[PDB]
């Protein structure tokens, strides 16, 4: 599913991401924009053999099981395919664990390089929330 900007903002808010770990909703929407362009079916293969999945490009080295990342963990206790669903519940629940892991949203390199420090409120501007 390819979400609209305000549609995704509303879904993220319903699942408790707004201000989670102190990160406003615009931070999460901005991260999703540059990780996946709002597409739940986005995937990206990494040089180390791991793969990133879903609207927040969550990685199989630590967070989900795909059966093809030797030595990896599955800290969100889900198949990576669950991160590709049209329903964002699994991605949100796993993102909550990731952002609590110590480095906040710096866990998403694209957030650090493209959202951090910017006017992230623009990403929810105009949305009925
Ligand atoms: Cl915001
Ligand atoms: Cl497996
Ligand atoms: Cl980047
Ligand atoms: K594996
Ligand atoms: Na894994």
UniProtKB/Swiss-Prot annotation:
The keyword Disulfide bond applies. PROSITE patterns: GLYCOSYL_HYDROL_F22_1, GLYCOSYL_HYDROL_F22_2. Substrate binds at residue 101. Transmembrane segments: none annotated. In the egg white and polymorphonuclear leukocytes. The active site is at residues 35, 52. Its EC number is 3.2.1.17. Pfam families: Lys. It comes from the Eukaryota. One of its GO terms (cellular component) is cytoplasm. Its main location: secreted. Disulfide bonds join 6-127, 30-115, 64-80, 76-94. One of its GO terms (molecular function) is identical protein binding. Residues 1-129 form the C-type lysozyme domain. This is Lysozyme C.
